[PDB]
Amino acid sequence: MHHNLGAEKRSAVATTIDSFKERSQKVRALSDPNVRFVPFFGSSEWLRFDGAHPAVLAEKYNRSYRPYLLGQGGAASLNQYFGMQQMLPQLENKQVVYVISPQWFSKNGYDPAAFQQYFNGDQLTSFLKHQSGDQASQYAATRLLQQFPNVAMKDLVQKLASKEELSTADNEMIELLARFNERQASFFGQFSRGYVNYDKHVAKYLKILPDQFSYQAIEDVVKADAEKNTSNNEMGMENYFYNEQIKKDLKKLKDSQKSFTYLKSPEYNDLQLVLTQFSKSKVNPIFIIPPVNKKWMDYAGLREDMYQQTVQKIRYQLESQGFTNIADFSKDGGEPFFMKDTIHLGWLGWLAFDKAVDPFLSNPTPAPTYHLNERFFSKDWATYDGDVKE
Amino acid sequence: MHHNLGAEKRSAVATTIDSFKERSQKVRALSDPNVRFVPFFGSSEWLRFDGAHPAVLAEKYNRSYRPYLLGQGGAASLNQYFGMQQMLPQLENKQVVYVISPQWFSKNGYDPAAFQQYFNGDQLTSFLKHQSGDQASQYAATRLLQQFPNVAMKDLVQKLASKEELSTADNEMIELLARFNERQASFFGQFSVRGYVNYDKHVAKYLKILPDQFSYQAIEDVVKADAEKNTSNNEMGMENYFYNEQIKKDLKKLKDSQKSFTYLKSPEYNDLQLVLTQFSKSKVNPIFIIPPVNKKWMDYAGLREDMYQQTVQKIRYQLESQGFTNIADFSKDGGEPFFMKDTIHLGWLGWLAFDKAVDPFLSNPTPAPTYHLNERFFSKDWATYDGDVKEFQE
Amino acid sequence: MHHNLGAEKRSAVATTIDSFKERSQKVRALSDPNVRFVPFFGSSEWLRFDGAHPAVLAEKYNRSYRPYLLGQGGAASLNQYFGMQQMLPQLENKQVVYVISPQWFSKNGYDPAAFQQYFNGDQLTSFLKHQSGDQASQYAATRLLQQFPNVAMKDLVQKLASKEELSTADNEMIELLARFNERQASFFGQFGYVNYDKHVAKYLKILPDQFSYQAIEDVVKADAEKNTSNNEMGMENYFYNEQIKKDLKKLKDSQKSFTYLKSPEYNDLQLVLTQFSKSKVNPIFIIPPVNKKWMDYAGLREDMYQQTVQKIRYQLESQGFTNIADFSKDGGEPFFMKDTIHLGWLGWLAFDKAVDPFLSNPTPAPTYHLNERFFSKDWATYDGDVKEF
C-alpha cells in the first residue's frame, strides 16, 4: 500500500463527503506506518474550526497522533457502522473518539436524505463480505431495506434480513464484487479540494496560536475570538449561525421544544451496531456526550429532566457492556464560550474536550473485555421509558 | 426509471465534476421523453454564465431543447471519449455541440492532473465493454497506460493496447463487472445534491434582465451594457474578475511569452479522432465550435495569427475530409469587442454569434450524414504534420 | 457480425425454418446500416410468390425498404415472441408488419409439433436474459413448461413461472450462457441462390419498369386468370389439384363445428403486444380473409369469423394499436387470394396500398396502454360482444 503524508493530512481535516465515504482517503491515513491517525467519529461537530479544535491543536503542537475527522451533517450510528466495514483492519486493536449526540435520538431516527449521501456501493459490498451471520448483520440488513426498498443486490440483503443461509454461488458473487470495489476504490479515490480546505480549517488558526503549549495562553486567544464572534446575541452563538437560523422567525421558536423528547428512538438500536463492531475489533473508544446551549434550551423550552434521562439511558447502554471511557459534558451547557452554536462544542468547549481526550490518546491502552447485550437491538429498548432494571 | 424535470434542469447547468463523470445525472436527463436535453461538450466554456449564455436563452424563451453542459477545466477529447462510453444509447442518432479549442492542441496535449478528476471506474469498465477491438480501442488503451501506468485491470488494457484478442474468461469478467458498475452508478448516483444555489446564480438571475420577446439585437443591448460595466479595469477587453487573478501581476513577464507557441503539433489530433469515430458509430450529428483567442491579448503575448489559422485549417481538414461539415468557425472573430469573456473563452456577444449557428441547427433536427473515416488521423504522422494539408495523403 | 448485402437479400426471401429461427441470418440483415430491412411477421403467408408480392414490389421498384419475411406453417404468436428475443435492439423504435390470422385462434391453440421446429436454445437464453420478471415472463415460462415439461434449464423457467425474483448468481449464469449462445449462433449460421431466382427474380421479368398500380394489376390479373383456370372457386391450379380436387366430397361441410372465438392464442398474442410496447415498435397489423366460395362450401361460418376479427381488433385497439389493414371481408373479391386462406395476386396489391404508405413514411410508435387481463383464461374463453366493453 502506497502512502503520502500530506495528502493524508489534508484528507484528515477535509471534512467532506468524500473524506467520510470513500475507502482510499481514510484507509491510507489510518494504515500509515509513520504517523498515527486516529478515527474521530461524529457528525457536524468537526465542521467548525477554531484555535482549540482537535485538528488545529495536534498540528501546531506536533502531537503523537492526528485526528481523522469522520462525519458530516446528518450522519449517525447507522452511517458510521457501514463506513467501518471499509476500514476494519485499520480499527483492529486501536483507540477512537466517538461523539454521541442526544439530538440524534429523535423518534423517527436519522434523516433518510442524509444517509443516501454517505452510503455507497463499496460500503454495500463491504457489509455483505464482512457479515458473520449474527444479530448485527440481521439488524443492519433490515435497516438498509427500510432505507432502500429496491437496493442493489436485493436478494442478498433480504437473505441477511430474514436470517437465511447464503448459497456458495451467492458467497462467491459477494467476494468477487467486494474485491473489485476495494480494488476500484483504492485506485480512483486518490484523485479527488485538498489544499484550500487545509488553509481555511487548520492553517488559519496556527498563526493565531502560541508556539509553546499551555492551556491558559490558548484560552486567552480563543476567548478573544469567541468574544468578537458572539457579537449579536446574548446566548453566546456564532454571528454567522445566528443570522442564518435564529434571526428570521425566531419568534416561532419560542417554546417549540416542549414536546420534543429523545427517550424513544431507533438510534439506540443503531448505536448497538457500532458497539458490537467495537467489541469485535477490540477498539478502545472514548465517548463524548455534548450539551445544548442553556440559554437556548430555556427559550425553546427543552427539558433538562428529559435531557439528563436520555444521557442516563445512553450511559447505561455503554457502561453495562464494558464501555467506561465517557466524557460527559451534558451539564456544561451554561459555561462561558463552551458552545459554538446550539448543539456543537466550540472555543473553550474544545479545551474541555482536549482535557479528557488528549490524555487518553497520548497514553494508548488496550480495550477491556466487553459484554454485549443483544437485547439492545430490540424495539423494547428502543421505546424504553423505565430505569436501571435489566 | 422515471424522470424528474426539476432534478435534470439543475444537473444540466451544474457544471460540476459529478455532472460530467457520473453516469446517473447525464443519463437521466438525456433519456427523458418529455423534454429534450442536448449534450453540450466542451471544457471551461460553459462555466461562466451571462445573459446570452445558451442555458439562459433556452430557459427564458422556452426552446424545443435544453443544453446539458458536459465539461470542466482541462477536459479535452480523451476525457470526452471516455465520458461518452457511459451514454452510448443516449447519443445514438442525436444532435450534439462539440467545442474544439485550438489551444488544447499543445505539444504535450492534455493535462494529466485534470484528466484524473473526470475519469472514474465506471468509464473504465464501459470502455472495456463497448470496445470493438479496432484502432480506436487500441489507441485509447495506449493513452490510458500513458496516463495511469498502474491502472485498474491493467492486464485487460495492455491486451487492447498490444492488439491482442481478449479471452473468453476475460470477456465474461468485463461483462459482469461493467454491469455491476452500471447498476451501482445508476442506483447510488441519484443522491447527489448541489443544484439550488448553482441553478439560481447561473440561470435564474439572468432571466429577469432579458426581454420577453426574442430578438438578437434587443438582447445585444442588454448584454452590451453588462460587458461594458464588467471590462472596466483593463483596455484589452477582458472581464474584471479574470484580469485581476490570472494576468494583472504577471503582466510584465507575459509580454512576448507566446512568441514560439505552435498548435500544429499535438497528440490532441489523435485524441480528436477517438471522438469522431464514436460520432460515426453512434450516428450523431455534431456542430463543432472553433473559438478565437483575444486578439489584443495575442498581439501582446506574441501568439501568431498565421499559426492560429493554420491549425484551424488542420482541424477543419480532419473534420471535413471525413464528412463533418457543421462547423461554426469563430477563429477570425478575436478582435471583436465583447466577443470574448477572457483570453480563450466565448462570452457575452460571442454567445449571440454562437446561438445564430447553434439554435437553428438544433431547432431543426436532421439525421447525420454518412461519414468516411480515415485511420491515418490516429497516426503520429498526422499528429506532428506541419505543411500543406491538401498534400497529406501523398 | 460483418455485413454482405447480397446474402441478406437472399435471407430475407429464403422463407426457411433456418432464416426464421437462426440469429445470424435475421440480425445480420436487420442490423445493416446501409439498407432498411423491415420485419414481416406471419406464418405461411409469404411462401407463395407472384408479381404483386411485397418482396417482389420492393426489389423491382427499389423502395426505401426490403421485407424480411419471417415464419412458416404453424408459426404463431408464441413462436414470434421467442424469435423477437434474438433481435430486440434491431426492433427498438422501428416499424414492423404483423399478420394476425383468425385460423390460428383454434381452441387447442398452436401445433406443438410445429413449435418445436422454430424454437431453439438461443431463443431460450435470449428470453431468460431479456425478461423483466413481469406477467409476460411469468406467462411465457408457464407456456414453455406446458410445451416442454422437462425443458432445458428447467430450474430457471420454473422460477419465472412461479414469479420468483432471480438471484444475482442466477442472473449472472443467464448472462454468461446467453452471450455464449449469441456468439455461437452469430457464427455457425452464416451458412440461398436457387431460392431467390425462383421466388423473386422470376416475377421481376414480368413486371413493368415504370410503377403504376394499373399496369401491375393488368400483369397480375392475367397471371391470376391463367393460374386459377382448373376450378371455379379461384384457387391456384397446383393447390387445387393437390389439396382440394381429390378430397372434394370429403371437405363439404367439414368445418361446421370450427370456431375461433375461444383460444390460448389470444393470450399468446398479448405477449407480442407487450413486447411491442416495451421495444416501442410501431406495427401494421394485417387481417386476412378466407376464400368466400370455399368457406360456404366447407361450412366455415362468416359470422363466427367476423366475431373473431372483432375480438382480435378489440385486443389491439383498446391497448393503443390502431394501424390495422383489415381485409377479412374481402374473401369474395376477384383474384384476391392464392388459395383457401392466403392473400395472393390482387390481394397483394390491396396489401400494398395499406403497407407501402405506412413503411415509406416512418413514424414513431404511440404510447400504448397495456391491459394484463388479456393474459387470462377468462379472455381466452370469451364468447360475448366487445360492444359490451
Next chain:
Amino acid sequence: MHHNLGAEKRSAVATTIDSFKERSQKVRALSDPNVRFVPFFGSSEWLRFDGAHPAVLAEKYNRSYRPYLLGQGGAASLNQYFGMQQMLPQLENKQVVYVISPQWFSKNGYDPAAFQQYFNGDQLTSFLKHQSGDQASQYAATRLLQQFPNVAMKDLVQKLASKEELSTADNEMIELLARFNERQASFFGQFSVRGYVNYDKHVAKYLKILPDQFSYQAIEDVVKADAEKNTSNNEMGMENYFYNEQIKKDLKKLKDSQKSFTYLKSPEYNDLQLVLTQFSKSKVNPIFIIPPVNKKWMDYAGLREDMYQQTVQKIRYQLESQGFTNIADFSKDGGEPFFMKDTIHLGWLGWLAFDKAVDPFLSNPTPAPTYHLNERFFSKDWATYDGDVKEFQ
C-alpha cells in the same frame, strides 16, 4: 497414468486412514489393467494378519486377484458409501467383498467420532457431483447434516436433504470444486508413503512360513500352531495382546454386561441401504461376509444368541429380498476352534473358511443380476422392525 505395481501392492495392504480415505492410492490400484485389485470393504477386519489372511494367501500363491483392504475401526456403511463416490468408474461392473458385522447395528448406529476421521472434502464434493436427486442422495445428505450441521457447502447438502433441485449456478460450483479436489488429491496424494514398510510386518513375514504349493490342510497346520502359541494366556481363544489390553483389566465388570444388548433396532439398516443402492447403480457383484461373535465370550458377557440370529435374519432379508444372494454366513461359527482372532473378528482358521467362500467367487467373475430395490429399507419403520421378516410387505 503409469502404474507402479510395487507401490500399489504396498497401498493395498497398508490398512491406514490414507489408504481408505484418500483418492490417489485406491484409484491407482483399482484402475490398473495389468493386475486385478479387488475392493475388500470392512471395518477393522483386515487390521490383523496371519498366515491365512486374504492378502497373504493371494501374494504367496500368486492369485488372479489381490485384495485392496478398505477400512478402519469404527467405519460402517455411511463411511464406505462416501468412499465409493471417489472410485465409481473403478467399481463399475466389478466384484467386491463386503463385510456386514451385526454388532454395527447398535441402537444409535455408527460412532460419530470415528466417522469424522475417514471423511474428507474430496468425498464431500464427489458425493455432491455424482448424486442423482433420488432417495439415496436425500438420505445421505440428511445423515451428513446430522453428522456435520456446519459442513462445508452446507446449503447444497441442505437442498439435497430437502429433495430440492439444484440450479445451474449450484451445479457449476460443484463441478468446479469437485474437479479441483480430484486434481489436487490425485496429484499430491501420489507422494504419500504412509504404511509402506507395513508390507514386511504383515505380508512378507508370513510368506516364509507358508508351503510353496497350495494345500488347505498344510496352511491349517501352520496357522493353528501360531494360534495355539498366541492364545495361551486365556481360555476363550483370544489373542494374548487383545485379551490383556481389553478383557483382563476388569472382567468382573464385563460379565453379564451385554444382557440387554440388542442389534435388531438400528439406523445402520438404512445406512446399509445406501451401499446396496450404489451396488445396484454401479452394477457391482458383491459377496457379503457375516461374522460371528466369540461364543465363549458371548456366554460370559450374556450376549443373546437368540437376538444375534434374529439380527442376521433381518440383515439377510434386506440383502436377499433385493437380489443380493452371495452371502458367506459365518454367524453360527463362533464356537469353532481358532475361528476368531478376538471378540468380533475372524482370524487364523476363520480366514480359511472365509477363503473357501471368497476364492471360488473372485477367481471366476460372474456379472451382477438385476436387483429389485425397495426404498422402504430407508424408512424408520424398517430401522426399528422387531417382528418376523416375512410379513414386512
Next chain:
Amino acid sequence: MHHNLGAEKRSAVATTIDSFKERSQKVRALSDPNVRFVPFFGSSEWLRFDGAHPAVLAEKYNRSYRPYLLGQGGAASLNQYFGMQQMLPQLENKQVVYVISPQWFSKNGYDPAAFQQYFNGDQLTSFLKHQSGDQASQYAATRLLQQFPNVAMKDLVQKLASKEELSTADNEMIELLARFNERQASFFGQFSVRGYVNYDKHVAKYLKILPDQFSYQAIEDVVKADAEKNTSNNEMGMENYFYNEQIKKDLKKLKDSQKSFTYLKSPEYNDLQLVLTQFSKSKVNPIFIIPPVNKKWMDYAGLREDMYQQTVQKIRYQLESQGFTNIADFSKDGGEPFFMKDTIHLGWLGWLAFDKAVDPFLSNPTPAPTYHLNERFFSKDWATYDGDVKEF
C-alpha cells in the same frame, strides 16, 4: 475459531507429517489466547526425546510457553516457507525458534523426495493468494516448478516465475480456490488425531524421572545417566539405535567419504532468504540454532572443520547483516560429552545448552527489530560464494 487445549497439546508434540503440513492443527494451537504456543521450526531435530528435550522441560516445570514442534526429516527452508503461508496471522509479531543446520546446505539442495510429503494443495493456494509479485514470489515459484513441473495451476505459478502480472480472471480463480482449500482444511483437518498417542510416549514418560525442583545440575545427572546406557556399543557418542542402522554395517565405506563435501555453495542460501523475507514481513523475532556435527564422526568421514566454520560464517553474515542477531551457535560443540544424540542432532546435554539460550529468550518476549533485507541473497552469485564474507 474453537480451541481445545488437550488436542492442541498433543498436536504440539505429535511430530507427524500432519502436524506440520496441515492448516488446522498448527493455527488452532498458535492462535489460542489462553495458552501460548511457540513455533519451533526444524527438521528431524524434535523427533528424538529425552529428559532435557524443550517440550519435556516446558511441560514438567509449567513454563509460560509450550513448543509447537514444526518439522520432519528432510524439511528445509523451502518447505517451511510454504508452511508459513497457512499460518501468517499466527506468526505476526511473534517469537519463534528456527534451526539452521549447515548440513542442509549441500550443493544441489534439499531432497525433493522428502519435500513432496510435506507439501499439499492448501500450501499451493495459500502461496498464490498471499504472494505480492515480488522477488520472493518470483524465487519460490521458480523453485516450485523445479519440484512440481506438472503442478496443478501450472500457468499461474509460471506467470509468477517469469515476473508477469496475473490477470483479473486468474486472480478470481486463485481467491475462490484458496477460500475453498482453507474452509476445507480447517473443517476436516480438526478431526485428525494422528500422533496423539505420542504425548504419553514422548512427554509424559520423562516427567516421572525429572526432579520437581528445577536446576540444570539435577537434570544433568538424570540425563547423563540416560546417555551413558544408550551409548554402550560404540565410542563415537552416538545412540545404540542410530549406530546399528546408519553406521554399523558399512563402516569401511564411510571412511573419508566426505573429504570434498562442501556446504559453501548451495541453493539453500536462497531458500533461507524466503524465510528471512517472511520473518521481516510478518515482524517475527526468531532465535537461530546452529548445531554442530559429531567431531569424532567428522574426523573419520574427513569432513573439513575449516569448511564447516566457513559455512557457519556465511550463514551468520546472511542473518546479522540483515538484522537477525539472536543466534544460538553450537557449531564448535561437536566434541562435547553427550552433547549430541546423533551424528547431526542435538540431544541429552546439548538440549540443556539449547535451553540456556532459548528459555531466557522466550520467557521474556520482545518485539522484533527493524530488518534491512538484501535481495542479493536471492541471487545465484550469493548461492555460489567462495571467498571471505566481509567483501560481499
